[PDB]
Amino acid sequence: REGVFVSNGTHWFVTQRNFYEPQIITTDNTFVSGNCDVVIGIVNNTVYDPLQPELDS
């Protein structure tokens, strides 16, 4: 939604474009459009869903 995806070599994070401030990638940081077969250079990772732990417990 804002910022870019970065990787320190082992983990992927999202951070604002003008200042390194890594955050866990969640559904509140990103948006969904299309699928994996269209975007050139898309990488595999996981997106944390803040709702899941609230309903699991």
Binding site: S33, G34, V38, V39, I40, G41
Partner: protein
């Protein structure tokens, strides 16, 4: 000068005009082809219009 992939640079350029970056990424080939054709048209104009 902070290196950035050109496609991501264009993603920022698109966000700056109110067009969500997924439009760029989904249409990256079309946009690149339109850019190359526009450049070719610039070449033809400069080579033909005194």
């Amino acid at each position: 000068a902070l290196q950035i992939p050109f496609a991501m640079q264009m993603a920022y350029r698109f966000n700056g005009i109110g067009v969500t970056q997924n439009v760029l990424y989904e249409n990256q080939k079309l946009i690149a082809n339109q850019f190359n054709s526009a450049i070719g048209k610039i070449q033809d104009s400069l080579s033909s219009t005194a």
